[PDB]
């Protein structure tokens, strides 16, 4: 129990932090990855002067603060502001004292060696956690779907990745990163919806375009004869009621937004798209392992939640793969937390105890110890 | 052959710096001279149009 | 070491020529711009004096 | 001559229409983009009952009419009232019959496909012009400054834009629109001038604040130590004589008004300003084309006429751009008509004849034909 | 003179074409081996609609075209697009009419019999050249270094080869091909340089990583205690100034890039490396000829130009070869054109006239004639 209860799992994202206790089924804490700094001197009624704001209080009060994102494209870019988000996570969100909890953290696919050593330096030397561990994100997603070999298409708020994993070892030279994700996708909907003849003028109009994207957006299979369908004008249309009455209608654009993930050309991106990239990762791997990867395309991440994403991907890679092959696109329902759940499982596991980096290992080996 | 070519390099690099500085000081003196030529040539068309209207 | 220093010499000598030409073309464009700025700054001191008398 | 003389160029703005014959050096007709509708029944002496008023007669008689602006932020918002401004342009202002003149029109940067088809429908089907053509405004401004690649900062009465153009094709995904322009700018001067201890009480006081803005306003470079200069009180001050004697003095505010274009925060705008936006457009474009755009910042529009706008912009983007770069801010003197002049050139050109959309093309292809 | 002046030498590569007149000391024409096909309909100012683009106009205009490489790994893969590059070479680059010039062409090491017959079919039947000849590339490189027996390590843009040659006959069963070359090498530098904490974001950032590789990259001897040296941080570092000011520094990676040629494991390649492969070629040859090959390791190709390549190879094979042996690594300065120069020599030669395949031979013997 000492640490059975006690292991923490913190998944640091570009848009959201997911956090909680190893053992739980889902994150106890989910909140924006921002750190707000007040543009002016003054106070809220009853509070003192605050130097900084994090998560939702930074979002809610955004009009008087300069908002900053510590993690650009999955990599920690500002370490002063990240230690601020961690502090908030332990002390306010989970309300635990960190110096008696083992902490499993996550990093990104080709996270620079030096960063994995730096967050270890900050975990052990400024938070004084007993022990910690850094798992790679795609690797926890895979594992949370039971398996050990597969290829994960991972897509969240600032990055998309393909991480081919074989008997647990993520394959460095076959990993692909595509910098277009849910953030890019909300801003494109924004324009095709103002372009539908609308105005997201106040900040209460801006924010909810993102809630339109999440609730009403679709990834149609045969996106071709779906536009064609749009035109005959079926009961395909969908009206959403705004903060007030102002019933906005979205028929068609509803799927023009996730067609951006297959066609980056919709947004002036010259890069290849999700399905081709799944494939290219795969023809960059060893030959003998390619049947395995093909029957185990695990999807994780908030942006892979658009319904019919899996069917489109299913047919997208069948038709690029040699017919002798078995294609299989696994997309679980909890996928917006796969990464986290894979960490919860792993860290609550009976056999993981012997991989925890302890302060004994650290004080004796330097940050190098956990770096592997 | 290497020592003679290093020495010549050093001397032509020093001349290139010395002239690059002269260009930048003229190029800037000119955004100034052209801009004062244009602020001058507007003030006039307002004063000469103002002249033709108060003469009329 | 000699071939790299000959190549660098050649490239900085080429840049030095390329910039020396740019200076000369600006330096000349400017005797022109300054002179048109002065041919301008005399005729609206004349036209504004002509204005103040026909306004008076 | 048939059409060498005969091509018309009509530039439709948010505040002004500019019109005339391809060939001329400047617009034959310039007038407000209003359509007045009388609030009461009655007549002027010697005239009949008039249902409507357009341009200057709507401005002059504004006290008995309800004034309406057909073009909101560069886009045509009311098509009944726009056909009224066109009618006025052909028949009264240029006094031509439209059915024997080719007409080059202009549209805005991301003008909805459907609008370009609608004004074509109205040009050919209600005015019966022989042929027409719709050019994008920034694109005519660039071209009128000789070149084909550059980025135009275009700023008039209701909109500001940045339109990066490469070998003639305006780059859709890099275009930025900032809804703060000369209209916004006259109303801000208004307040800093009443705030100087004044009153623009009657309508003959209101209108002339705009003529103060045009004649006496400046964009100072080092707007910082220009306020500082204001305080030592140099002979920086400037008094304007009103419709009557009432000599009003404007020293300082004179430049506080165009500092609004770099600082939207002066007016409760949270958007970025002109120079940052020039830049952001540029780091949204292809990499290999960014040296071109930087050496070709062409300015056009009534609001970019404030003296010292170019020097401030020069230094504003040098200091944001990588030092290896050449910055170059072209601001021609005729810039309040760049757009129009670019159309005059193009439409009088020897090679343009083969791009005119003719009634033959239209009656045979539908509005789609000119839409491109 | 008839053909003394008149012989053409065209060396077709995976990345570059090298072309010119037999007699000259270096290629009159060097340009990318691409054929661009426009993604959209439209024109450049003053030109007509172009169906296709080749060489540098395809590279320069790459944003609106789909680029294609006719030669994959030294072998011609698309014959429609190759006839396009040849056409460009004769008519635009060298501006000659082909029907009065003998043409010496080059092919790759184990070029399929059928290809040598096909380019002969296209040379004689669609270009109508008087006579032609196909030389093997390593064989021209050797010969340009004076000799007739040696082993060439040939390395360009898409392939590396080892071609042991004895009294002029390239030895089929001892030839080795390693598909990792300068193209692979620019993309690896790219990643170790973004991994140094950088961004080659626009296309003007992408292209110049290749100019960094060419200018600043090194092949260190004792690559072991060169990394060790990197750490003590000597004045080993090297900063390059980008298209703009943005001075990028490259200290160490500078040599980590050509260490890829000895260690393919740096790039997820399981194949053996350059030096081992030199050697294996050699222990696949007759016994009595192995002292000859060892004292005549001739290097040719753009990717063998990295300084200190020869010293590393010198010591790499001394220490694998029996000590009774003399090792000798010849690497001439003009080596990026060895192949071409060997063709220029040979084809301008007094004795070569009797090996030219003439239209008489062809019209009478079929493509078989030149195939040998």
Author numbering:
A (entry chain L), D (entry chain K), E (entry chain M): 1 to 372
B (entry chain B), C (entry chain A): 112 to 167
What sentences appear in the manuscript?
The conversion of the chemical energy of ATP into mechanical work by myosin involves coordinated changes in the actomyosin affinity and the orientation of myosin cross-bridges relative to the fiber axis. IFM also produces sustained isometric contractions at pCa <4.5, which we refer to as isometric high static tension or iso-HST, that correspond to an isometric tetanus in vertebrate muscle.
We built into the global average of all repeats a single atomic model of the thin filament with 28/13 helical symmetry, containing 16 actin subunits, enough tropomyosin (TM) to cover the 16 actins, and four Tn complexes and then used that model for all the reassembled repeats. We estimate that the azimuthal fitting precision of the thin filament quasiatomic model is ±6°, which for a structure 8 nm in diameter gives a spatial uncertainty of ∼0.4 nm on the perimeter, assuming the actin filament behaves as a rigid body. The present result, in which actin subunits and Tn's are resolved, and weak and strong binding attachments are distinguished, shows that the target zone comprises just two subunits on each actin strand, positioned exactly midway between two successive Tn's on that strand. The MD Cα backbone of weak binding bridges was not permitted to sterically clash with the TM backbone, which was in the high [Ca2+] closed position. However, strong binding heads inevitably clashed sterically with TM, consistent with their ability to increase activation of the thin filament by moving TM toward the open position.
